[PDB]
Symmetry: D2
Subunit: 385 residues, 4 copies
């Protein structure tokens, strides 16, 4: 279960770099130099790193200081062979974003948020990023009167359309991935789930430029089934990127290492990504708990990749098992793949066996055999075969 | 606060007709004759009634018995002037639907579910229904292996496309409204939220035929902001119908009368529907608690319309108050309506005031004045002005 | 992983006997004869069975019919060596209990609830039950005015005190176990958690007669940590019985087979029961999903026992691993067991190393090493060591 | 609705003084001087203020600086007539407490936690505090192996017993109030609910010295019914203090102003405190949202007190209404207060009308009339009577 670059495991600078400051507590760790993170991550077998503008270049830096920061980072990439597959903008930390970036009530803040984004897009492309992530963490409200949501969606569409116009006029080979979250740090966040984000994208001027970047813990904060949501994104052809972590249900955003939280959902998720042949980064957006020192930081990070690899092996074994293949036929998963009425509407309407002469009682008596299947899946996950 | 037919208040036969059978308990009330419900509802000031096939015609009825049931009901409509604005199919009660209607693993069940739906569509149109609701209550799973979700979405799209082909080939003036629910009676239900349903509709062959029928308590079972979700549906032009009830957070589906549960969310919801000029039915999909006798049934039903009317008056007063108008300007809701960059991308890129010369500290120091606004909204809701 | 009688696995008659009626659906399975369940359960290697009075004796049976039902049951126990370690009363199904048993607003219903309970205590004692469970599933409210909770707690105390007096006056060797549940089928149920039940017991006339019967899925419906609550019950000396099943989050009460739902919590629960040396029944209060025929019913039951046995093995291997023992020392689990100030208050007050000369920064910098420890537990759970 | 000192409204220094740092954002407001808060709060009509040691005396101040801070504070209290009814210890902010105070795995940290607490008790007594609050916000875990909960409860008992010994040996008139919270900032916090805290107190050496300090939003984070939990605390004689604020569901800890969040629960809570005659402080532990400047801060604080006062009026009118009194009799609230069997066990056993001749069907048919009662409460709350 040794990770290698071929596994496409990526990490945000802000993940292993999180200092442990929470709503009730001061930082428990010193800041990590981005170049140190790059080197340590390369050693652990990571494919690449990702960043917010403000992770790499401290807010407010002069152009002189900005250029120095990028140069040191780029040297560390050159030395290690680490990739930068994705980047994103910090539109949530600075007090100016307290009511949003793209959907701030103040017009001047919205124009500022766009300019800050455009600037980092240029940098992302230059570094080789294929995906530009937007998490509108401050877009939303604590109170019902504070935000007219139809106007806010107009402003959100406007911002993303402008971003698409920018990218296409520059000739950039980069796509956008919108990251939904139901709440935190706002009471309610706009585009709260994968479904909301998918629906929103279809109203943009160029929908082909936009996908979703779903996060395990985000969807689980609404008590939603994360693999079901991923399946929908894949069904729509919009899974551009994914953020992997752990979450123990409906509560604050925990950002546990991948594999922690809902272990069975992690198993079904890996099963789905591997069998759908998802070929994007497996990005870990997580925080080593503030109880940990730096040794614990790197153990937590190693743990994320390790659990992914154990889960992949178990899922592959589950699908390869002919007893599982037999169980799947017994539960009629094969019949689910068959069209309901490839014979067409008229044939269906005239088919007496579909209704007039359908035996409802015989069909209702058929067991689904789902519990036996699920126990085979349990046995495999636990390696108790 | 007397309801009249002009208020467009509707009720399902299954609402006031619910006998009080829950997962742990037997029925506490005798069954209500549909004709008695129609007459009692007319007396309370209702605009109309809605039905599942199986509410009006008991499952399994011969064509002879079916025709008798429809005749008695139609006579009661003729006598009262009550409308039937909406109908729907029961694809969840009979054991044959234990694994779904449209996305059952068994192909024969899927064809049956389509034929049962088509038959009731004919009846709905004949009675004057404008909206046909689909709640896929059994579409989903308790276990991860039981349902390949991409295949299930293929089957769900296939069923709805066939329904659209049927309706258009008959020349019917009826639209479909898909009703999302996150869970219950399945562990997870397909198209769990308003967002998921909106995104799904955009992949149908004729998206113009399909909208959403969101329910207050459904969205609140995922801890989502129901008014935000409605605003999105309205923004997309897809709010075809709405189900109103009450829910006390994330737990089982409670179906309290409208106004109970989250009272402040009810206020914001009524504010939004009235100010967006929603002109569809205000349908109450609720259950009088099984503690109640028939007198309590009709009091609960009256209560639904009464709370809507009190909330409408309070919301109207809130918006009419020039002190509220002043508070809205102070929180820059007016600036939210202004385009971010009607000057265009190039002008934005060249605008030094948007970035190079933007004063971030002055803009960050501006208070949003949201708490004062929210207290004005509280004062109005409570009539403490 | 074969269960044998010495593993102390027990099942309610109502568990494998659930016909699959939910709030949205009719029964999918025919009724089981109690004697068939006993025999089938004995064949799977169960230790014993439990029952509500109404599972064994249909409601309102004459004394003559009552006798015939008990006779047939007793014979099946005689033939198999199956034990009856626990019994309980159904005070929730019949419409008369729609507002509660012990805490119904109507005094005549409360007396009847007590008499119905007392009758089944005699029977339970005769059959060999050591624990008498009480789940007050109807005690509570949907609305704030319906139940004065101080008065209701007086009535609840009164009922349990009367039951205590009854048992001690008969010289019965039977203890009560109160089963808490946050909600469903009432909007909120009284004594919603393990904590509320523990606190309540301390105010009864004979606290020594009463403990708790916590259920995995009940506490998880409040998003609480089930192993933590079980630890508190053990700490207090009050874990008289336990109900085991699975639950996926804060939602309706799912009753999945044990091991499904929150798998990691199930691991930590088995670890705790086994290391504390709990010696009571391992009772499965679950429902085979209504998708299943009878084969699926027995597959699901066997799965409960299998998952307990696998987790038991993995928890044992975890605790036995010298490398885990090393990690436990590294994380100072051993120091948690040493008294904070066995030297006393005066000694603590005079100890300068405790405050005045305490090096806060040196102690703050120590890593807890919790992540490495947790990954070892993960590796053991998955058999990846 | 003007608050005056006799209404007993109090505020923590940390509430109006919150600078607006959350997990995703920097501070949006400058620090408040404690003396400015005292004065501004006195002007709004507050009764008193509360503090953590670290709110008043910056962490690690010399004894000389400590004295100067207390002196300035005491003078502001002297100038205004502001009381200090409660005080508490910060055992959560400093990195040293990252694994807890009283239940840290490191014994030296636990001793330091006790000494830090004892120092502030002396100060609290000197200032006139009658209640000493303890919120064990760091006591808990993110992972199952990190904390043996039985040992942790031993350490928690040990600490509270030492504090009890200290207070009684000094002859102080001060009582402890334990503040439960389900999660945040730890994954799960020990003593997660009002119930767990009540139960724990019964195992302390001097139970009479300890009660609870429940918070609206804490219990609501577990989806529990806050007025029910407060009723249980009152029933037990343990409601020593209360924290009032608002919370919208199971999610992160929001700390909205009181009256926001679950409005109906706030009505039922005010009804309960006022009719039980609670005479302790009405303490607001809330945070003005970080969107607000200082004007918004004081608007939000005034809003807390205003909403309490409006709800108090509506609850009083509700109880005083003869029509509500009639509805309470119709619903048998008065019968709930009569003992179930003051005639005794033997009399109940011999009473044939209690079982043998009890007409279950006649009692089952009685409606509870709860819906009509609840609509009257709704009408009163909204001023629609
Ligand atoms: O909750 C935070 C979001 O998960 C993440 O994408 C990073 O924070 C991205 O900006
Ligand atoms: O949860 C049930 C759904 O709310 C309702 O639309 C009716 O039940 C429609 O079939
Ligand atoms: O839902 C019921 C509770 O889980 C247990 O009491 C058993 O079911 C016995 O009544
Ligand atoms: O979140 C903290 C708790 O709500 C209360 O203790 C106060 O904040 C005092 O510590
Ligand atoms: Mn993320
Ligand atoms: Mn994250
Ligand atoms: Mn509905
Ligand atoms: Mn409903
Ligand atoms: Mn139950
Ligand atoms: Mn149970
Ligand atoms: Mn708190
Ligand atoms: Mn508090």
């Amino acid at each position: 279960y040794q990770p290698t670059p071929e596994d496409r495991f990526t990490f945000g600078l802000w993940t292993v770099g999180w200092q442990g400051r929470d709503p009730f507590g001061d930082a428990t760790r010193r800041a990590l130099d981005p170049v140190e993170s790059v080197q340590r991550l390369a050693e652990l077998g990571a494919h690449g790193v990702t960043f917010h503008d403000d992770d790499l270049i401290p807010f407010g830096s002069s152009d002189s200081e900005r250029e120095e920061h990028v140069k040191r980072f780029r040297q560390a990439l050159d030395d290690t062979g680490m990739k930068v597959p994705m980047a994103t903008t910090n539109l949530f930390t600075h007090p100016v974003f307290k009511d949003g970036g793209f959907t701030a009530n103040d017009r001047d803040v919205r124009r500022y948020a766009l300019r800050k984004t455009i600037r980092n897009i240029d940098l992302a492309v230059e570094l080789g990023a294929e995906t530009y992530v937007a998490w509108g963490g401050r877009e939303g409200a604590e109170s019902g009167g504070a935000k007219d949501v139809r106007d806010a969606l107009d402003r959100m569409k406007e911002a993303f359309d402008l971003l698409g116009e920018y990218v296409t006029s520059q000739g950039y080979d980069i796509r956008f991935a919108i990251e939904p979250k139901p709440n935190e740090p706002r009471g309610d966040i706009l585009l709260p789930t994968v479904g909301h984000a998918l629906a929103f994208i279809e109203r943009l001027e160029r929908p082909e430029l936009y996908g979703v970047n779903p996060e395990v813990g985000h969807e689980q904060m609404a008590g939603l089934n994360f693999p079901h949501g991923i399946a929908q994104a894949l069904w729509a052809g919009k899974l551009f990127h994914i953020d992997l972590n752990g979450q123990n249900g409906i509560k604050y955003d925990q950002d546990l290492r991948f594999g922690a939280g809902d272990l069975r959902a992690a198993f079904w998720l890996v099963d789905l990504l591997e069998s759908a042949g998802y070929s994007g980064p497996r990005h870990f957006d997580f925080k080593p708990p503030r109880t940990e020192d730096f040794d614990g930081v790197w153990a937590s990070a190693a743990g994320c990749m390790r659990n992914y690899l154990i889960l992949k092996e178990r899922a592959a074994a589950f699908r390869a098992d002919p007893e599982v293949q037999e169980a799947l036929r017994a539960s009629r998963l094969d019949e689910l793949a068959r069209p309901t009425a490839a014979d067409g509407l008229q044939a269906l309407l005239d088919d007496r066996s579909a209704f007039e002469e359908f035996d409802v009682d015989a069909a209702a008596a058929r067991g689904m055999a789902f519990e036996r299947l699920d126990q085979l899946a349990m046995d495999h996950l636990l390696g108790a075969r």
